[PDB]
Each structure stands twice: as C-alpha cells, then as structure tokens.
Amino acid sequence: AFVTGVPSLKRSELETACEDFSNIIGSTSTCMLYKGTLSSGVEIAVASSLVTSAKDWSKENESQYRKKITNLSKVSHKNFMNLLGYCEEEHPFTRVMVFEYAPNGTLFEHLHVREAEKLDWMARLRISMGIAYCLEHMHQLQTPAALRNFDSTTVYLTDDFAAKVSDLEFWNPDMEDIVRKYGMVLLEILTGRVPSLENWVSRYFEGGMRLEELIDPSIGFFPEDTARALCEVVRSCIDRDPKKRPQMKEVAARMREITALGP
Ligand SMILES: Cc1cc(Nc2cc(N3CCN(C)CC3)nc(/C=C/c3ccccc3)n2)n[nH]1
C-alpha cells in the first residue's frame, strides 16, 4: 500500500473489471484509458501508463506515480473525478490509477461538438458552480498540481450533468493561473467559444458589446443581469495582473451568490 484510504487492486481484479483491457475510452499524453465495471457494478475509468516494461520506467517515474496517488487520495470532492484505487504490478508491468466513470464525457464535447442538443442556462450555472467548488477545495488542500491541465477537455459530466474536474495525466502552476483558467472556462460556458478570445471579449469589457452578442445563441433566453454578474466574475479572474485576481474562495463565494446553488 502506498496510501491510506485508497484500495490497492490486484491486476487479476482489474483484468476482470476491464475485460482483459479490451475497451478503450481514450488516450492521452501519459496514459491509456480503459472502460471497466467492478463486481460492485461501479463503473470505472482505468488510467494505465504507456510503459510496458520495467526498463522504460525510471525511479523518477515511480516516485511521481506514488506522489500523484498520495496527492489525489487527499483530494475527495463530489465535483472532482476521484481516485477509487490503483494497481502496481511487475509481472506484467502495470502502473494504473482507477477513477470514477463520468457517463456524459467532457464539457468540451457538450459545448462544441454536439450540434443537435445544447446545455441550457441552468445546467451551465450548475456546471460553473461545481467547477468553482472543486477548485476552491483543491486550493484548501494546497494541491493545484492536480489542475496544471485544467480546461473544458479535462472537466467531465456525471449522469445528472454535475461537473467533475479531473487530473488523469501521470505527473511527467500558481493558484493565480488556475483562477484565470477558471475565468476562461466560465467565459467558454457562457459564450460557446473556445481558443481555436481575450481580444474578442475585451470588446465586451471595453463596453462595445451587447450581452445578446456575447452569450451562446444555443442557450436561447437568459436573465440579462445574471449574465452581467457572471461576466464580471470572468473579468476579475482573467485580469492581466495575477496579483489583482480574486482568490478562488472569493470566486466560489460570488458564484454561489449569483447562481443560488450550494455545494
Ligand atoms: C477518466 C474518465 C473519463 C470518463 N468518461 C468519458 C466518457 C466519454 N463518453 C461518453 C460515452 N461515449 C460513448 C462517448 C464519450 N468519453 C470519455 C473520453 C475520454 C478521453 C480522454 C482523453 C482522450 C480521449 C478520450 N470519457 N470517466 N472517467
């Protein structure tokens, strides 16, 4: 065991759950993702290193592995994609982390890829609020390392479209940097726009854009003054000077106020 709290799986266990690793959700810089189901019926996303022998794997690699598990085992939040387990094995070489499975995939997909169906206003506020609570909690745990890769492709959506912020990448940022990224992700949620943006939105901030220009047209109707308040949160978060940015606890506080949604 490398940690208290998080169970250490036999590879035999995980082979069962993931049908001999036969079902792939995705693939990233540092890991392959396999779909599984535990004998408890709990759906899982298994993140496996891209290293297949002890040779391609350093003691630096190993040290990073155990640090990540340590750090993530300390993070537990309803709006985080929580670590459920891990599996280290030498025969054959296995370095795995087991995460919660989010059936509605990424925020990015639901904002930009699905043409037929769009997230409504209230679902967008709920997602925005959830993200903010997650980041606030992480800043309280002093583990922003888990957020070095934060953007709409790393935020997942549950059955009921709650946000789960993820940290899937094997470990080979300021909280001020995370606050700005939160600003940009909130802006993306509001507008439906993604960096192929600051210049575009500066026109809104300059006073030369109506909210019906800024807000994602797929939304339909929306409360103007709510939208206004959310855009000020964006403006605060993305200030060019990191020192002028709100703390995440202040962001979460203001967001709670505007959305009227508790943690
Ligand atoms: C880590 C994790 C992912 C996850 N859920 C899901 C669900 C999902 N869906 C839902 C149903 N699918 C039929 C379509 C899209 N897609 C993904 C994609 C993951 C990925 C990540 C990086 C690169 C490439 C791909 N993750 N839960 N936990």
From TrEMBL:
Keywords: Membrane, Signal, Transmembrane, Transmembrane helix
Molecular function terms from GO: ATP binding; protein kinase activity
Subcellular location: Endomembrane system
Record-annotated Protein kinase domain positions: 19-258
Cellular component annotations (GO), alphabetically ordered: endomembrane system
Top-rank taxon, per record: Eukaryota
Topology of the protein relative to the lipid bilayer: Single-pass type I membrane protein
Name of the molecule in the record: Protein kinase domain-containing protein
Gene source species: Zea mays (Maize)
Gene it is expressed from: LOC100191492
Shown residues within the full chain: 204 to 488 of 510
